[PDB]
Amino acid sequence: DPLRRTGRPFGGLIRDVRRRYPHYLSDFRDALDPQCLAAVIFIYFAALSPAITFGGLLGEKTQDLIGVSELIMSTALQGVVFCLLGAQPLLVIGFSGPLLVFEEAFFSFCSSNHLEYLVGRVWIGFWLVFLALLMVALEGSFLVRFVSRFTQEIFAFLISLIFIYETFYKLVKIFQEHPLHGCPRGQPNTALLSLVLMAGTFFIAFFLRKFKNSRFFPGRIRRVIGDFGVPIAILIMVLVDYSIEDTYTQKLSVPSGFSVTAPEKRGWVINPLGEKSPFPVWMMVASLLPAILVFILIFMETQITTLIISKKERMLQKGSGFHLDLLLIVAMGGICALFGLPWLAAATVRSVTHANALTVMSKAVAPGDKPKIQEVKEQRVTGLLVALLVGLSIVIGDLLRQIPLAVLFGIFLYMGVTSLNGIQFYERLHLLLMPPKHHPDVTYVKKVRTLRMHLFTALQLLCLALLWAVMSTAASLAFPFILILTVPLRMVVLTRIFTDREMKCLDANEAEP
Amino acid sequence: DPLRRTGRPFGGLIRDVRRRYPHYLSDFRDALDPQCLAAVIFIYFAALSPAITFGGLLGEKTQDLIGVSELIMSTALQGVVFCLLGAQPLLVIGFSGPLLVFEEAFFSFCSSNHLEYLVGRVWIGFWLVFLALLMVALEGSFLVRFVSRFTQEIFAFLISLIFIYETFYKLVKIFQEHPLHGCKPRGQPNTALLSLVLMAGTFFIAFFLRKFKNSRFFPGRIRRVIGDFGVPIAILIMVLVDYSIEDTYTQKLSVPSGFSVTAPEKRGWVINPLGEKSPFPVWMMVASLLPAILVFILIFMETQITTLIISKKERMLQKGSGFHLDLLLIVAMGGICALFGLPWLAAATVRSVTHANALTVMSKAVAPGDKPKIQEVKEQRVTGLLVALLVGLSIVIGDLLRQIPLAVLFGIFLYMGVTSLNGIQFYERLHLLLMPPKHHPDVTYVKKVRTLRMHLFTALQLLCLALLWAVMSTAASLAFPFILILTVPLRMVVLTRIFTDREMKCLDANEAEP
Ligand SMILES: *[C@@H](S)Nc1ccc(CCc2ccc(NCS)cc2S(=O)(=O)O)c(S(=O)(=O)O)c1
Ligand SMILES: O=S(=O)(O)c1cc(NCS)ccc1CCc1ccc(NCS)cc1S(=O)(=O)O
């Protein structure tokens, strides 16, 4: 029982270290496998592109104080450190939306009150470090036991439906800028060529995915070719685009040189005191509240991601760490805030994709259903390699300018669609449309009436819709608290409506029950 | 045994009439089924488009002596009298490639020798009628019993593959006239890519609805009704999508206006058997027997092989087919329509197969293992008659038809070509080449035949198909029917020595589960 309160200071941290660190050389020996190369290549782009996008957005929102280079250099240096000293090396940490919202809100607050922004974030980082140390000392990561499977599949369907809505609203906007008229802002043949490239990439990678499980060719060649599906699709579509000469397509652009984005109003080291004018003393002690808010955000997303990754269905044997994963992340964020780099948190879709890009499926028997997961092939090399490649991507800035963005949209759609399977809420959504005589032989259909599982699904959908509506309004910083409020809902309100057997069968801690 | 020599004049024709005509009202009362409407709508376009294409080509190649108003009126009047009086009403008859090749060759010959073309074809038609009557009287259609499944699976494969090359060539050439440079019409932008988008959308919606028809979603009746109307739904959706766009130019379907000949200044509706302007030489009247023999061979091979493919034992056809009352009605409506200047017609293989398998009903299954089996076919005389009548009256309408782009129909044609491939064993044995020997299914011809002696059969069949294609693509392509005929002596002599009796019996067998 990893989530147990020992009753001694730093007990959980010591237990996690003793559990994980003995299996150290195994991680480096396990990496010798040609599936690791495919995983590295696939995850490199999925980690690089959000860095550029969110760096551009954050540079636009602020006065060009934090840009793209700083985000890349924070991502690389936190990823390397975490993969070297982390308990769970299958997690990919990076910038996300809620952090951007908090950053813009804090910038607005600082600008309104005539305060320093970069100097202001240093005290927030210090308070973050203090809170992390206090929580690890008096161990409180045992509260993750109360997060069930009702509050962790209302949050992984919303973080996968908010990433397929905006991977195709970044196409409905290359077709409003370059519109289809006749006789850059007005180029022809661009909006349709982008559609062609995106469709080609996502239909190729999902047929190589189907071909991986087919009966054609020898097994070893078939599996090797199926592993390299995304790289093959990317290379094919890049060559196809390169063949065309006159048509203009937007291409991936990275900054040049290792330097700050505002070399005339900023430096690499931020003074804790006033950089130009003295910092008010009252703000030093009043900076505790934003520290609490950002701590709550980071804690919820990292812990829920770790819970989703470490399910018993996915055959993970070495173990996960709920104590040596939050201290590291929060301490790194607090330290990076001193140099002006942004804070980082584990990414859910990227971590899930990285985890399920290394799974090995059982060699079946004609009867067998969806093959079962045999192993996961976990190691400390893929994440470290991805983080350094992202770090050194500035030096190779000429090879990356030959890759259009429209090709990567198909890969992003592939990621979003693939990450959906494996959660029971999607399956219960599927069961709504099928007639009651075609339902499968799972444990929550046989022991539960048909009209009382649809009610559970309807309530879960109502909660998800409320979460989305709250996120889309002018007060979106209360989203973590609304998500937290689902736990008392399950523990109080849903207990009265449903009987003990129905609740036990519907959301069980494990498979079968 | 329909293919048996009775020994009496017109015995086969009488037997076919007595077998088929009693079940006459059944055909008209079977048509009350919403799958028939979907079949009619699907086959209407598949019959209309080749008429326009081949009419344009033949008008180009014959100095506008036969156009697309003579191809839309031979296709519609010679197919309302094969479903009214035909033994097999699941056949769709229309113009094809070999007929076009023969027509251009005959036009060249007539132009070289200063002869009349339209007057020249009348005697060929008369000799065709005489040959058909002579062959039916002697009941010579029993020779179809010697065409196996080695010489009729080669044909199916070639025809579907040459219909999937021509759809791809139409696209390759919309991007050669309108190229991606950027700055009836030529050089327009956004056209070559929009055509690709429309074609891909139609094709993928067609397969999506085809797969949804067999899914477990929605009630069964609604699911099957929606799955039946897959092609019409895809066509309507893509037509609306194209109609939404305003400025981009796309080529659209065009039909002639009015019921009249294409050259009203050098042609009429009735061709005089004698000289139209100058007297016709007497020697040609008797020398026209050879082209009549050639066109008779072409029509006979096409129609009989199509009827053989349609009437397999696997597809649950119960009323019966006619090998005699379908070669006196096709080679004698043709023959006598050419005294009015209309072209000859023969049964179309892909269109007939599509029409046949668009009415099949698959069994309600149980659990995975084999693909559902055919339960029935739902054969009737109404769908073909309605399609022919609609093709005939497609001239008064056409303001509606000018709103339909060609790029949408290319996806439907590709769907037809891909779908028509399944059901023949040569494709399955081609699939078995790539799979390892431990994944072969439990069919009768894998269990009883060694692995390395079925690959040899497949290789020889591929060699024959490649030789057929090479001969078809050279400057002497009128010998293709004879090269196809030569496969029967090959199977009956050469392949007997190489393979043992058991291997030949299992490989090529008259019926599933030898
Ligand atoms: C491709 S990276 N384009 C994307 C733009 C934005 C996002 C994040 C969307 C988002 C989610 C949640 C919140 N508030 C939670 S308190 C705000 C936003 S915002 O629109 O950025 O402001 C993404 S992705 O979800 O990370 O894929 C992609
Ligand atoms: O094979 S098809 O009947 O689909 C066809 C389609 C098109 N374009 C879209 S309708 C164009 C031509 C054809 C017929 C191809 C063909 C097949 C055989 C022969 N010779 C046999 S002796 C000749 C042709 S041809 O039309 O290219 O001359």
Residue numbers in the entry:
A (entry chain B): 673 to 855, 894 to 1223
B (entry chain A): 673 to 855, 893 to 1223
From the paper:
DIDS is a pan-inhibitor against the anion transporters from SLC4, SLC16, and SLC26A families and chloride channels. The molecular models were thus built in the corresponding EM maps, respectively, using the crystal structure of human AE1 as the starting model. Using similar methods, we further determined EM structures for hAE2 supplemented with inhibitor DIDS (hAE2DIDS) in the presence of HCO3−, and two maps in different conformations were reconstructed, one is named hAE2DIDS with C2 symmetry, the other is hAE2asymmetry with C1 symmetry, at resolutions of 3.08 Å and 3.17 Å respectively. In the EM maps of hAE2 with HCO3− (hAE2NaHCO3) and DIDS (hAE2DIDS), the electron density for NTDs was not well solved, and thus only TMD structures were determined. In the hAE2DIDS structure, an apparent, continuous non-proteinous electron density was identified, and the whole body of the DIDS molecular fit very well.
Anion exchanger 2 (AE2) works at high cellular pH to catalyze the exchange between the intracellular HCO3− and extracellular Cl−, thereby maintaining the pH-homeostasis. Here, we determine the cryo-EM structures of human AE2 in five major operating states and one transitional hybrid state. In conclusion, given the presently revealed structural models, the AE2 uses NTD as the intracellular pH sensor to mediate the anion-exchanging activities of its TMD, thereby maintaining pH homeostasis.
